[PDB]
Design a protein around this ligand. Structure first.
Ligand SMILES: [Cl-]
Ligand SMILES: [Cl-]
Ligand SMILES: [Cl-]
Ligand SMILES: [Cu+2]
Ligand SMILES: [Cu+2]
Ligand SMILES: [Cu+2]
Ligand SMILES: [Cu+2]
Ligand SMILES: [Cu+2]
Ligand SMILES: [Cu+2]
Ligand SMILES: [Cu+2]
Ligand SMILES: [Cu+2]
Ligand SMILES: [Cu+2]
Ligand code: NA
Ligand code: NA
Ligand code: NA
Lengths: 298, 298, 298
């Protein structure tokens, strides 16, 4: 895209503020930002806020979201589709033109770990170029295992293809499959979908802890066989809905856009790989690391 | 196949009649019928009854099916395998030769949304060429959410490959991935697996309704990440068995041949896309539309 | 690998012995062994014990495994990762050098049907070349349907690619997808992942029996749509954990490394194919047979 040549829009922080007991404002951007998805490999991503996947959104069950998208892309329209919400797609997930903003309001009625993504046609193109992310909706009544959890992180799986190549997006294997982690609490890492950061800077935990991961496989195209090496998931809540409760799973199958809350115990010090067990994808980047120490700091 | 050149056997209605409180007769054909799977693209499909996927079959839990296949294909044997039934495959799912009929009897003991398909070797060839469909077995005791459902439809996902090309069937990506809808009640649409009909003639619903979809991904080869844009599944019954009850799923993973009953509420007027969230497949056709109006008519 | 030319190390029996009420010794090898994966097609597999998938391991919930790997590979290190266990991957799943042994101890706290595999980088290479298998951990309190089961077998699905070809492993479709069966009781077959043995020597059962299969799809790369033709799964326990209990499934989606206990009734004499319903994979080998006779012997 000629108007994207040389464009690298600096990341912009997500803006969120609660405006009522059940109402939250969220403002994101759509912007074009260079991301190093593998060493030496820059992808001029189509993004929300200069991150791919985009910034984490967390709201409470029953919050209505008053969402503004500021489209900084000089030429391509963009939009926002939150899987969390009940909305009219043709009214509420509509395009915002370059250099314009749009505001849309819709409720997040359901707890869980939801994909969000750009909804502009061709949706595959917008997702594959980077416009994906997660919104977590916290259950009003929690999860039954909340009191057992010592630490928690968010992980997202996505693929990267040949740059803005619709044929490859439709018909080709992913060039990279990657994890990223998005911060829930101050000091948590906040990374983009790349093949290396969560290997070189593992997530941290302490021996004996029960870890919760909020996970989503945003695709665009692949399913995920999510597995933590050296442990078993004590409890899994499919899509993060507390009712969808499995126990003792070695691996959690996630459809494209599928989410889960998974919990597991790390019993010994060491480094625990986190993979999709579709090992072609793991080999192409989709291995993160959890470093478990006696203290929980590196 | 030389004997299929120029062959386009007009669709024949499914014939079904109840012959006892727990016994039903079904007669289908196997026939060769041109189907427009994408605009300008005719596939000379191997079909049941001139539809691909084939006609919907609905029976009650505990019905024994006395099934007749009339093979109108001039040269290729065909057969029928219902995933609903308990049967001896080597006695009851056997081939019916060209211009012959065969009758087989077997019980549908289990509620759900089952694939049916031709079972003639190579099965991949018979399925990929179009010989797939759904049989719904209605649970004797219903689903616990039956009283909440306002409207219901059947959707089927399938792929199309290069024409009768076993190498492509085995080793190639699908050229198209498509939805079709099969009528449950008079006035429901009844369509074939194509890239456009359910976009141009969306399924219809009314604002505020809870919609049930009986869905099956017949493949032949892909899994499906089934998602309705703008809503969340309130309730999901995997394979349509009432016991396999999930709640609040954004997306339902369906194996190849996998079924589900999914229910969701449409809260606002508009058009709601229905996708597999494996967006390569969506881009290659697998987007249907649900048009939600204040009245429920177009 | 030059040092593997001409190498065909004869299979070595798994060695296991109970050493305490909750402690078991297991000794395996890593070895290079020619396996006929399709007729006329020898794969010089990287294996545990000269089998691919490797030998079945069965332990009880709560057993600690004192595992020794004797690496007979003349040049490549190998390791063992049991999905059943809680272990430090970087201490307990570490490499054993050629002509050395290593012993590692870890508990199997969780019931189910777990993948095991070599964990040596690149893991994809070690798995794809054959270093995969299943460990079953028997639940202390059984499964609620135990008393209904008449007969049981273990089946494993795996893929085979072009020989030791990392590009193909990462980016190519599988050349073969196969089932094997591993013996639970004397007289059960014990086979390797190939396209033909379980067609030519079907598993055996008797009319009217309820069959349990312990299944795992070890991949490396594909998911599995596991289906038995002519029946429906009465009960399914995902990953073999008794809590993850589905009923009346036609087909069970297994992620890569995913396991299940599935149970079904065979009501009539005949031969019942067992497939992954991703029919490209079935066509490329992944069809096993269950021969059901009035007596249960051939
Ligand atoms: Cl692993
Ligand atoms: Cl979508
Ligand atoms: Cl089948
Ligand atoms: Cu507001
Ligand atoms: Cu966009
Ligand atoms: Cu593993
Ligand atoms: Cu009759
Ligand atoms: Cu046929
Ligand atoms: Cu979506
Ligand atoms: Cu010992
Ligand atoms: Cu190895
Ligand atoms: Cu089938
Ligand atoms: Na591992
Ligand atoms: Na969408
Ligand atoms: Na079949």
């Amino acid at each position: 895209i000629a108007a994207h040549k040389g464009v690298n829009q600096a990341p912009v922080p997500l803006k969120m503020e609660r405006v009522g007991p059940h109402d939250v404002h969220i403002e994101m951007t759509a912007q074009i930002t260079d991301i190093e998805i593998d060493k030496g490999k820059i992808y001029k991503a189509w993004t929300f806020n200069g991150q791919a996947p985009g910034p984490l959104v967390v709201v409470n069950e029953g919050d209505t979201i008053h969402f503004t998208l500021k489209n900084m892309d000089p030429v391509v329209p963009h939009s926002m589709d939150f899987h969390a919400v009940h909305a009219s797609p043709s009214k509420d997930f509509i395009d915002v033109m370059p250099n314009k903003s749009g505001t849309f309001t819709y409720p997040a009625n359901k707890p869980g770990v939801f994909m969000y993504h750009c909804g502009t046609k061709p949706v595959l193109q917008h997702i594959a170029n980077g416009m994906h992310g997660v919104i977590i909706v916290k259950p009003k009544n929690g999860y039954p295992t909340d009191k057992e959890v010592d630490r928690e992180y968010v992980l997202i799986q996505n693929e990267w293809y040949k740059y803005n190549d619709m044929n490859d997006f439709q018909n080709g294997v992913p060039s990279y499959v990657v994890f990223s982690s998005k911060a829930l609490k101050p000091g948590d890492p906040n990374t983009n979908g790349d093949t290396f950061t969560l290997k070189e800077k593992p997530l941290l935990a302490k021996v004996g802890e029960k870890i919760r991961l909020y996970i989503n496989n945003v695709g665009p195209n692949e399913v995920s066989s999510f597995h933590v090496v050296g442990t078993v998931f004590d409890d899994v809540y499919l899509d993060g809905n507390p009712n969808n409760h499995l126990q003792g799973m070695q691996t959690v199958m996630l459809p494209a856009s599928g989410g889960a809350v998974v919990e597991f115990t790390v019993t010994r010090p060491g480094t625990y790989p986190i993979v999709t067990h579709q090992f072609n994808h793991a080999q192409k980047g989709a291995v993160a690391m959890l470093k478990v120490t006696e203290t929980g700091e590196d």
